[PDB]
């Protein structure tokens, strides 16, 4: 009967920037009010980019720890030293160049979306594969992407911290604490 109360934090009203967006109006989690201080479109873009980066990085860490390697003796290093070894090897610089060109295109997308020159949704790059045709299907698919991205972000955080703390491959089950 009063404020549109946030579902996540029941004692804090939902921020108006969370209306009509993916995720958002199912949980409305924003107690610190970051959406009240920054554009919701930019926050959503950053969230989706972080989710995708983490979903790739978590699986990369899993594959590297479990023993999957490229057929080169230069890659016979642990996942912890993989970054430094490959930075000194060269491929990290090339990966950075390629991610740089892709991020130049992403920056153009953001600039042309925030200025309204295009009609782009925050995280949309045009890729429409396995995307439901029905609008509710699209909304719930975007929901699934967001949930998986957030889960992978937290999971990769834990994986990196535990791997550094205990020299051990991904499952960390044995360990000692």
């Amino acid at each position: 009967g009063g404020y549109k109360m946030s579902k996540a934090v029941p004692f804090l009203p939902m921020s108006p920037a969370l209306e009509g967006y993916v995720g958002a109006e199912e949980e409305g989690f924003d107690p610190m009010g970051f959406s009240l201080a920054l554009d919701i479109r930019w926050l959503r873009e950053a969230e989706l980019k972080h989710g995708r980066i983490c979903m790739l990085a978590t699986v990369g860490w899993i594959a590297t720890d479990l023993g999957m390697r490229l057929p080169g003796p230069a890659y016979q290093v642990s996942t912890l030293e993989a970054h430094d070894a490959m930075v000194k090897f060269g491929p990290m610089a090339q990966i950075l160049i390629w991610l740089g060109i892709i991020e130049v295109f992403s920056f153009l997308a953001i600039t042309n979306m925030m200025e309204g020159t295009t009609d782009r949704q925050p995280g949309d790059y045009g890729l429409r594969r396995l995307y439901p045709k029905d609008e509710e299907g699209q909304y719930e698919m975007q929901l699934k992407e967001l949930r998986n991205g957030r889960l992978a972000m937290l999971a990769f955080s834990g994986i990196v911290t535990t791997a550094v703390l205990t020299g051990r491959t991904w499952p960390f089950x044995x360990x000692x604490x």
Binding site: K4, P13, S15, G33, S35, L36
Partner: protein, 98 residues
Amino acid sequence: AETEEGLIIKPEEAGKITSRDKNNNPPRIVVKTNDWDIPEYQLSTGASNQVSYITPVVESEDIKAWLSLNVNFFSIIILFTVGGLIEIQRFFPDTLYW
């Protein structure tokens, strides 16, 4: 534009207008200050979840206009020229070819 729904009211009706908003935020008092950098300071009447962005408003057009200023143009060109000279010196030191 950014206050499409604020129920913005004038000082003369500080305690008269009560219709809150499309949200439930109470009406906000608009004070017309004479500063050009802050032409209007908005004052609240109660607790509200108002979206006030702290980010600036920049656009590609005037950022490019700033980079088109003679300082930026003649600094980028001279920086590239100096860097090219330094790179040539690294790659062909001591002008042995001469």
